[PDB]
A paper describes a structure:
The calcium homeostasis modulators (CALHM) constitute one family of large pore channels that contains six members in humans. Although sharing the same number of membrane-spanning segments, their arrangement is unique and differs from other large pore channels, with an extended helix located on the C-terminus and forming the core of a cytoplasmic domain further mediating subunit interactions. In oligomeric channels, the pore is lined by the first transmembrane segment (TM1) of each subunit, which forms an inner, of two concentric rings, with the outer ring being constituted by TM2-4, with TM2 and 4 of neighboring subunits engaging in extended interactions. Here, we investigated whether these placental paralogs would form heteromers and characterized heteromeric complexes consisting of [name] and [name] subunits using specific binders as fiducial markers.
In case of [name], our selection efforts have allowed us to identify a binder termed SbCALHM2 (short [name]) forming tight complexes with homomeric assemblies. We have then proceeded with the structural characterization of [name]/[name] complexes by cryo-EM and found two populations of particles showing either C10 or C11 symmetry. In this dataset, only the reconstruction of undecameric particles resulted in high-resolution density that resembles structures of [name] determined in previous studies. In contrast to the [name] structure, we did not detect any dimerization of channels. Another pronounced difference in the [name] structure concerns the conformation of TM1, which is detached from its interaction with TM3 as found in [name] and instead projects towards the pore axis. Due to its high mobility, the density of this helix is only defined at its C-terminal end at the boundary to the extracellular loop connecting to TM2, whereas its remainder towards the N-terminus is not resolved. In contrast to [name], where TM3 and TM4 of the same subunit tightly interact throughout, in [name] both helices have moved apart at their intracellular halve. In the structure, the resulting narrow fenestration connecting the channel interior and the membrane is filled by a bound lipid. In the [name] assembly, strong density of appropriate size and shape at each subunit defines the location of [name] binding to the intracellular side of the channel via its extended CDR3 loop. On [name], the epitope encompasses residues located on the intracellular end of TM3, the region immediately following TM4, and part of the C-terminal loop connecting the short helices CT2H and CT3H of the contacted subunit.
Author numbering:
A (entry chain C), C (entry chain D), D (entry chain E), E (entry chain B): 39 to 308, 314 to 329
B (entry chain N): 1 to 125
The structure:
């Protein structure tokens, strides 16, 4: 934590580069983490992969990209807001650009010999005592600008969060209560699918280990899992493909379908052999 | 706006001939999908035949090829079907359906209009 | 918490902008949060969406908008009251506008060279010792005005809260006890509907996961949910639409109806196919 | 708490305005809260609403208004008593009106140059050392007057509370034991009615949610509520109206009636269709 | 912990060697540990061993090597990031290379007698008081460069982690949900195989000890292990060889196979005698 503490290099053309790096790089890392952790980017990638023909129209891809970027940008925005409200980075970056002519609150004692160097050295307390008033005059100005920018950022972000939702409810063909039900269903489906995938994988692995050694060393909960849930085989690759991708609220016979797993279960999702272990049986014969 | 009146149901033994009529009243200009469906208890609904007013071609189910035919009277704006070589498997509720194209926008899906009419056709033996 | 601490930029034409930003932006954010969290704005939006013809009259829309804004404005009003009673923001904003002529409580030692700059620099303790009395003379004045405004705001808000309720009970066609019963019913209906929506979504998701894997890994409470509450299908979209929107106390056969869910359950709410998954069965045949 | 701390603006014609605001506004807010929280003002408003003809005589309306105001004024009176006994507000308000001629306890060192300004600046410790005795001379006087007023207020309030009760028992047609029984009955009726209204609303909401989803997700206590208390319908609007309003001890066949709910239950409270959902059945046919 | 504390040798051509050693050697050790602990390098080695003919193509070997190196390089990268952000190692290494001409923030008091020696002696506080400003001028510069490099490293690493995953999901023939299921299966298979190997080895050892002494001193859990899981013999060497190596998602009859243990269990993995204890029975006869 003390490692990432801000340390302004008081040098012209050098402090703003350090501020830019030390502020943007954490923001970029947070943006990357937000992109990676989201599962909508991955099924968007899966759609672009399996479609392989640019079949999807511009509107749905644009909507998904906007949603992913908006969900990811929360952490960079709040990090930037905190950094701006702190004021250290902005004063460090903009100390060297302060105009000596515009300086006030003291008689004109500011030298013009090396103006940029002294202005850049202000943040590190390396201010001559004869310019003790000027240093504070700049410190209260640049920090003010920093905090002003932070507050404007919070205002703009709040306005965007208000407007985006006000348009999302207005342009959606569904009611907001039905969309809340849909969100609840999506959360429950994701959690249940993950849990059952874990259990199914454990049971299959136990069967394989039993085939190898002749028995399995299982715990009591694992024994209950094996007894209650028996597995006969593995789901085919097309069955997995039928449930991976983006879904936009299709309706069948007046009844809503809330995911492509639901659509597949209803039966609305389901010659050439690929990535086979061995050749056709005719070739195996020879 | 569009209503379909179906008639001709009755009881005919195997090997008989039946003529079922469906009359359309209303805005038939936009209709491009004219066909018949059969559903039986304990099973879903399947289509015996349909025709294209826009393109002209026609489809018959596998059990309908060479056995039953469907014709359209443009002047009468009606649909006639002829059940020939009747079988006990034909005991089902019969409906005539009309659909007006269907336009797919990628964001929302398919939208169209569909119509139905309730009828029956049961063969004694 | 220390991040949002007030820091007055002692500069003319610059401190009041900072005060305005640092006070209004939190107020705007609180107003936006109050608008978003309320569910009356969302069913108002749903009404404006599904009606799509400006069918609703001016009076009900005005009443709903007034109610939403009044409920949302509670947090901005108390935030502004606290900020005004603190006095820091107001003195920072209005230091530069103090008239030197009106200054008193000391002999006329106030320079007229740069009056605005010294007046604006008063808050940051950067007051010359020869003007030590003037600084306090301004500090006790502007802060007084701030606190006076805060107390007037509390008085006006209290008067409005009194008058609005006195008119709400006077102009309502119902008695206050019946309206209390109606509010209790609305709260209970909302909570029960949310809980049952969660349970129904969980059961449907469990059915889908069972269809996929052949079993579901459920907890004991989830097992009780599955056993007690079985689901056969999903409610249609028009059924959801029939219960989303604004409702204003209709009465059927002399019996009150307290929500459009109640009205739908009584049976008073319930050709063209929209957003279908696949074309008509006639088109599916080809 | 430190926000509402008193801060006297030591300026003529300015400190008494601040004292008046900072004392009256809390008193006004407490008075408004006392008015709002009481349920007698609301059924008085309901009476004035449903009667809609000024039918009620002057005596009962005057008695109810007096009771409501007397119950509400408890908090403003004690707040004013505490503020007066503190003495800060009164000395701040009346410092500028102290007569310099009446000042004593020191030789006549008080200047007549700006008498009002120094007198007003006394509270903020901004008293010249040559007038150090005068400042205390005023501080012990004005504070004394403040505390005297506070004690007189407590005496008058106590006398009024004694006299009002002595007249309430004297002029009432009932005995004091019967009135105590009546008060106990009113409290029990209010609590039981609120509890049963909550339970009835919950059961009705559960029925509606069951109609929507096909089941309700209820807790064990909610399950007990549903099993024990079934609801068949909602009470009509006139039934609610028959129990809302003011009641003054009517007697039926020599037997007391203690509320209009009791009077309605005894059967002594119970063509044109208003606020209907749909037109008459004849109009519905077309 | 205090042993590994950094101690800069303030000497030219000597401090950067110490920094290089004290930074790289921990990084090299962490890289070696990451390589060793991973089990993918070992089955890659097993593949290169048993194949013994360079049979595997360049693409799969390259992919496995890339995966192993990427998983191993996490610890060296974060160690280097922390060391760079600390700044001590970089300033110690680059103190002697600072150009005296480029030095600023002070009048030209820097001697040119032994420039390199004083520059190298800066980190150990052995700076003459006449060069007290120069020492800080260098300390704020070199440390800045160190921290800048650290932040650039974090940015590049984050970009690579984003891009690699974005390509891994794009070029994989499987969906991401199926790959998650595959990962869950691999984890469960590894844990179960290790547990059953431990139990099987314990039971075999117990049988051997019983053969030696006539009984085994077993604990209650060991008694349960012996009773529940009996072993008849040891698996042959080819059976072990059939499950050790690298596996790349073959598919049999449209059904996925997730490991070579699974492939062996399905039956798709299974004259000269090697490493025998005694000669052929014909030679044993003589
Ligand atoms: C650490 C958190 C503390 C709290 C502070 C942040 C608030 C979090 C709660 C609300 C967030 C939310 O719900 O945002 C969601 C929306 C996404 O809308 P969409 O992309 O149209 O998707 C449609 C809606 N979906 C996702 C339901 C389908 O985001 C936004 O549009 C704005 C996000 C704010 C940051 C990015 C603003 C633009 C970049 C900056 C320009 C100067
Ligand atoms: C953090 C809280 C601490 C306590 C301090 C606040 C009191 C909260 C409890 C009472 C609130 C309440 O109940 O307000 C409710 C009413 C809404 O009335 P309506 O819009 O006509 O709707 C009719 C009533 N409904 C909602 C039951 C249908 O609000 C008001 O009219 C005034 C709200 C005060 C803030 C806005 C005043 C105007 C803006 C400022 C102008 C200078
Ligand atoms: C925080 C509390 C701490 C304790 C200090 C206060 C005592 C509280 C307990 C007794 C109160 C009580 O019971 O008051 C009740 C009576 C109401 O009488 P009524 O209006 O004729 O109604 C008849 C009686 N009912 C209500 C039973 C039907 O009030 C009074 O008449 C005086 C209230 C005192 C404040 C207002 C006085 C006038 C304004 C000031 C003028 C200078
Ligand atoms: C102590 C940890 C704290 C957190 C900080 C580190 C993040 C850890 C979580 C993500 C790691 C991860 O998942 O990395 C995994 C990938 C491996 O990708 P691949 O080799 O193509 O294999 C394909 C993916 N597999 C393994 C699933 C099959 O790594 C990388 O490509 C980058 C690793 C970063 C360090 C090496 C970068 C290059 C060297 C430096 C050049 C200047």
């Amino acid at each position: 934590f003390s490692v990432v503490a801000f340390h302004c290099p008081c040098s012209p053309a050098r402090n703003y580069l350090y501020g830019l790096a030390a502020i943007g790089v954490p923001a970029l890392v947070l943006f990357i983490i937000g992109i990676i952790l989201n599962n909508h980017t991955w099924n968007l990638v899966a759609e672009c992969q399996h479609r392989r023909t640019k079949n999807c129209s511009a509107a749905p891809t644009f909507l998904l990209l906007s949603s992913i970027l908006g969900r990811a940008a929360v952490a960079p925005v709040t990090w930037s807001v905190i950094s701006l409200l702190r004021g250290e980075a902005y004063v460090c970056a903009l100390s060297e650009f302060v105009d000596p002519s515009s300086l006030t609150a003291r008689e004109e004692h500011f030298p013009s010999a090396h103006a940029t160097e002294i202005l850049a050295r202000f943040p590190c307390k390396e201010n001559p005592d004869n310019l003790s008033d000027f240093r504070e005059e700049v410190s209260r100005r640049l920090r003010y600008e920093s905090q002003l920018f932070g507050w404007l950022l919070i205002g703009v972000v709040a306005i965007l969060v208000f407007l985006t939702k006000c348009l999302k409810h207005y342009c959606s063909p569904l009611s907001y209560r039905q969309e809340a039900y849909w969100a609840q269903y999506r959360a429950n489906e994701d959690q249940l699918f993950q849990r059952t995938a874990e259990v199914h994988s454990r049971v299959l692995a136990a069967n394989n280990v039993r085939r190898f050694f002749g028995f399995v060393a299982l715990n009591k909960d694992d024994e209950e899992l094996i007894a209650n849930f028996p597995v006969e085989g593995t789901q085919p690759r097309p069955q997995w493909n039928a449930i991976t991708g983006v879904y936009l609220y299709r309706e069948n016979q007046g009844l809503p379908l809330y995911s492509r797993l639901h659509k597949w279960a209803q039966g609305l999702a389901g010659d050439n052999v690929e990535m086979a272990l061995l050749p056709s049986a005719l070739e195996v014969l020879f | 706006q569009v209503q379909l009146v179906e008639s001709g149901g009755g009881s005919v033994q195997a090997g008989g001939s039946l003529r079922l009529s469906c009359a359309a009243s209303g805005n038939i200009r936009n209709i491009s999908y004219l066909g018949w469906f059969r559903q039986a208890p304990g099973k879903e609904r399947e289509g015996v035949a349909a025709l294209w007013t826009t393109q002209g071609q026609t489809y018959y189910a596998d059990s309908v090829k060479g056995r039953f035919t469907v014709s359209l009277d443009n002047a009468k704006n009606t649909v006639y079907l002829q059940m020939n070589s009747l079988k006990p498997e034909d005991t089902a509720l019969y409906y005539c359906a009309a659909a007006t194209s269907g336009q797919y926008n990628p964001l929302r899906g398919y939208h169209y209009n569909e119509y139905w009419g309730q009828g029956t056709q049961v063969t004694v033996s």
